């Protein structure tokens, strides 16, 4: 099963999904037919194996299949790890999902487009989201250099090397690529083999995981004799699940109240291959024994799964400590952030979930929020991200920490 979760943030159509395609091969389908004329709409998913040509020279030594005879020669490249990606979308409005997605990341790669004006709305929006949540292991990537003047891509590298200054981004390297002709990708694999190291995770900890998809496997027409169970897609962060454990989902289904759903892990799968257990980094899918109605389209989106008989709060009202940006990096316009007024509706992005809520308390950096849909707060360390409907479309404006 994949070791780690690398996110591919960035503006729209810079080719995020395409870079994922040159690295893994996989497409995100682009589905719902709509995505097929549009673009990535759900978080895309894909995995890959990274081995290295010991017996030759780098970056090219950075392989993809147990095969070195591609550069230098044969000695079956040594396997370093198997990684997974999370393709977000790029569209100014899918902000609410990409946020959500970050909650699973262990690191990222910022795909800027080589042939469009560097700090483009969403590129920034993302970047600052990254420095805000905590994803500090970053690799910027200059994508569409296969369509530019050898001057242009260097001058952009300048504006980048200059943005990456005052900000937290010391030597966040910048590896120009060609996601279309898959050029230079191996030096990208060497970047991501250096800088996006695979974090240790104490297993002993409470089994806890975030959900961001869920499907009804069942084909149009499978008979009842073999109706395969409900299936929950998401990522583990702390602990580890095993086949045949007893589990619950929070907040779970609603009545207006919100109760937890129990079931047994029917099965465990990463990519297309089945495993008996599952550990952090990656996305998994969990076969369950619950009525697939319950998780068709992606119902339990923003829900979390933990140990059955476990101690987690299903809050309706929450104590956020908090801070603001001075600007709204996400509108083409940078208008200065108005301080929070109470009785205001704000999107509270907590974990994978995306919930809406109203402001009851307004202090210096501690506001109290009342929510439509409960949030199961698993820790005291619960990072959150706070947004406001500026001009019809929502916008990332500030953050903080959940408090219990």
């Amino acid at each position: 099963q994949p070791e780690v979760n690398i996110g591919v943030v960035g503006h729209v159509d810079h080719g995020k999904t395409t870079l994922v395609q040159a690295i893994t091969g996989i497409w995100t389908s682009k589905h719902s037919e709509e995505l097929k004329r549009g673009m990535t709409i759900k978080l895309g998913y894909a995995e890959t194996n990274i081995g290295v040509c010991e017996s030759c020279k780098k970056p090219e030594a950075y392989v993809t299949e147990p095969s070195c005879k591609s550069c230098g020669s044969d000695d079956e490249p040594k396997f370093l790890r198997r990684i997974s990606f999370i393709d977000a979308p790029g569209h100014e409005v899918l902000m609410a999902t990409m946020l959500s997605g970050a909650a699973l990341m262990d690191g990222a790669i910022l795909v800027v487009a080589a042939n469009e004006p560097f700090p483009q709305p969403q590129t920034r929006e993302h970047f600052v989201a990254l420095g805000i949540i905590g994803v500090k292991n970053l690799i910027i990537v200059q994508n569409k250099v296969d369509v530019v003047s050898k001057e242009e891509a260097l001058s952009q590298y300048r504006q980048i090397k200059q943005f990456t200054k005052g900000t937290w981004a010391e030597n966040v390297p910048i590896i120009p690529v060609s996601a279309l002709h898959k050029i230079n990708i191996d030096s990208l694999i060497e970047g991501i083999e250096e800088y996006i190291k695979t974090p240790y995770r104490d297993l002993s900890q409470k089994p806890v995981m975030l959900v961001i998809r869920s499907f009804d496997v069942n084909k149009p027409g499978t008979q009842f004799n073999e109706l395969k169970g409900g299936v929950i897609g998401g990522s583990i962060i702390q602990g580890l699940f095993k086949v045949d454990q007893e589990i619950k989902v929070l907040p779970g289904l609603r009545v207006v109240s919100y109760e937890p759903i129990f079931t047994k892990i029917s099965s465990i799968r990463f990519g297309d291959e089945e495993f008996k257990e599952a550990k952090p980094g990656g996305l998994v899918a969990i076969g369950t024994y619950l009525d697939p109605s319950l998780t068709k389209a992606d119902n339990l989106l923003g829900s979390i799964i933990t140990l059955a008989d476990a101690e987690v709060p299903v809050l309706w009202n929450i104590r956020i400590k908090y801070n603001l940006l001075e600007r709204v990096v996400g509108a083409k316009e940078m208008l200065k952030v108005d301080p929070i007024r109470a009785k205001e509706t704000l999107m509270l992005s907590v974990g994978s979930s995306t919930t809406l809520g109203i402001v009851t308390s307004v202090k210096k950096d501690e506001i109290e929020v009342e929510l439509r849909r409960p949030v199961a707060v698993w820790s005291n360390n619960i990072r959150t991200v706070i947004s406001r409907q500026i001009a019809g479309r929502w916008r990332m404006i500030g953050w903080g920490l959940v408090e219990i």
Binding site: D146, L154, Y157, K161, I174, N184
Partner: peptide, 17 residues
């Protein structure tokens, strides 16, 4: 640090059609 990069830019450019 530009050298590493400037290098990278070189090496891709020399892979075009």
């Amino acid at each position: 640090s530009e050298k590493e990069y400037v290098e990278m830019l070189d090496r891709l450019y020399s892979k075009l059609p």
